Paper text:
Recently, a new plasmid-encoded colistin resistance mechanism, mediated by the MCR-1 protein (a phosphoethanolamine (pEtN) transferase that modifies the pEtN moiety of lipid A), has been discovered. MCR-1 is a potential pEtN transferase that exhibits ~40% sequence identity with LptA, which contains three domains (intracellular, transmembrane and extracellular), with the extracellular domain being the active transferase.
After model rebuilding and refinement we finally determined the three dimensional structure of MCR-1-ED, which spanned residues T200 through I540, at 2.33 Å. Similar to LptA10, MCR-1-ED was found to comprise several classical β-α-β-α motifs which constitute a “sandwich” conformation, with one internal β-sheet layer and two ambilateral α-helix layers. Compared to the stable core of the “sandwich”, the interlinking loops of β-α-β-α motifs were much more flexible, despite the fact that three of them were anchored by three pairs of disulfide bonds (C281-C291, C356-C364 and C414-C422). Each asymmetric unit contains two MCR-1-ED molecules. The two interlaced molecules are almost identical in their overall shape except at the potential catalytic sites T285 is phosphorylated in chain A but not in chain B shown in omit density map as well, the structural details of which will be elaborated below. By sequence alignment and structural comparison (data not shown), the zinc ions in the MCR-1 were found to be hexagonally coordinated by E246, H395, D465, H466, and H478 and phosphorylated T285.
Numbering used by the authors:
A (entry chain B): 23 to 36, 38 to 344
B (entry chain A): 22 to 36, 38 to 344
Amino acid sequence: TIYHAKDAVQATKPMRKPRLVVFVVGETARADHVSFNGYERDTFPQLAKIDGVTNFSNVTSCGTSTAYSVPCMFSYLGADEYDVDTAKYQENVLDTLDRLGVSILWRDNNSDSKGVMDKLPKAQFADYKSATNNAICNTNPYNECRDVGMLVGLDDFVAANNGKDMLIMLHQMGNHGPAYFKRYDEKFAKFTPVCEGNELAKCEHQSLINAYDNALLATDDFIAQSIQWLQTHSNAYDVSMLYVSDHGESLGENGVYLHGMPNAFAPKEQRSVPAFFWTDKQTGITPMATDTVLTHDAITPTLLKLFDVTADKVKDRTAFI
Amino acid sequence: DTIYHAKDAVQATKPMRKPRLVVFVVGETARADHVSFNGYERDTFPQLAKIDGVTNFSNVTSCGTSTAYSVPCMFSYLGADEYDVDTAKYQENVLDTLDRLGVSILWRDNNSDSKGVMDKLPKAQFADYKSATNNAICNTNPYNECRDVGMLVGLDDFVAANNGKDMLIMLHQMGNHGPAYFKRYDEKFAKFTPVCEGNELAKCEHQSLINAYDNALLATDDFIAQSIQWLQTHSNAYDVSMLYVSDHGESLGENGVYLHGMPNAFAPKEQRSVPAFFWTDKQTGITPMATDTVLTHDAITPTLLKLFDVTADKVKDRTAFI
Ligand SMILES: [Zn+2]
Ligand SMILES: [Zn+2]
Ligand SMILES: [Zn+2]
Ligand SMILES: [Zn+2]
Ligand SMILES: [Zn+2]
Ligand SMILES: [Zn+2]
Ligand SMILES: [Zn+2]
Ligand SMILES: [Zn+2]
Ligand SMILES: [Zn+2]
Ligand SMILES: [Zn+2]
């Protein structure tokens, strides 16, 4: 195991108020389909009614796929030295925070870690793609488990870690294709018609867009209920929520669909991602400016600052806060 | 002791093949949004507009907002996110690499100093051009300020002295340095008037300050063009290319902010949005990146290496200008 932060120190310890953070790892969401970034439809109407939400209009993802971007999102090495083949053997930020006492839990309704959780106890990773753990899989014809199912019973995690610092990753299914029409329950079918087939190139363009934007409305609801769930502990915990998407998505420009293109050739749409940060006013955390130029490189500094941790390798590195 | 980052660096072909001669103009205080090619409403680069083969890069971000921070970073191997200005002078930089692989390195400075970038090479490869001892062009203006075009005089003696070798020539411009923009150019570029002729810029009328700044750009446009014109006189025997990047931008009164030097955490967009131009001769086989490519000062080191067919297993995937 190769270290990058054994100098890491937690300045104050939970004493002081414990801190509770949800990190929503998003999936396949494009920045230019976010209402706040100038999009022509209102894809985030619930987040708009929550005070304290910062939308970041200029964030660029590490890469264009889940396997590539996710480990880089928790890396110390930054996009320009990230190497997907050796990422799993590096100390990542969750290894650091777990070593300083923060309780880490990772619930996944997408796929896996991807390696990011592999040095921590297996009990701290939970698969939520199956109805064995996810209580919300019967809400749609496809028996697809839903991201909001990752919220059920999180109060049992808090009680089991009463008074400790806590960081909760919720890894979204989000907007992953090609079958966007299956990513959301029927209550979010606001834009119609939608394309209902797995060959995007036969979709009519607007039907494809409509399905994709309905999926964002489902993600907007999931994020909104994530913050509402944290508000039930604003009494005993300093609560914050952070959202960043792993990568964007192509929707037919120059004939390009889905994602996964090499960075040297990937179009703008595959790397321009939304990010949200919310925190309760009790907590004293100040978000950076909304138009700050940011990348996935800001996640690791952000996560460390959220828990008052210092490591002489990532400070002065721009964060979301 | 010097800390190395590219002792693996390898030159694929040697000068065999045609030798290569490159001028790298390190600019000063130039803003991307005052360049005509980037949509500015005045023609601040009328001579560069008449040269075939010039690529303008419309989305380049400087490492920092000052000479001390940006210049060493422009030649670093570490990238902005691991660059540490306090220790940059003990790092192998890209000029150390190219020098040990045989490329002849020259640094002429009409700005200040290196800043540390040249400190491991023989002092004969750095030349001060701020004074009339080396610069022949200083009596052209009330202030006896020596001019950037004086750095072009006698470069054929350097080429002759390194005949057939690969060569990279840094010319460190005085350029658009403030606050006295009106002093940076001779009267032949005093095209936009009235101009402000005082130090504390806030009393200036906005247009008169802008006018002095834009005349200063016309002087730079002339310096780059004649740099290209000088390289064209050796396109026969050498593959010639010119690269220009400014060290940082400049604030011109927006929200009351002038000059540069703000910490990156608070710096306005204008202090970091810089022009970059790359020119190359017909014969040379070098292809520019797309002009809207998102770039930073981190692209300079790979560019210089690729210009000399050098590969270094540390910047191998890093975006360049070419
Ligand atoms: Zn995917
Ligand atoms: Zn993904
Ligand atoms: Zn490194
Ligand atoms: Zn780096
Ligand atoms: Zn590899
Ligand atoms: Zn400067
Ligand atoms: Zn100065
Ligand atoms: Zn310092
Ligand atoms: Zn030599
Ligand atoms: Zn200066």
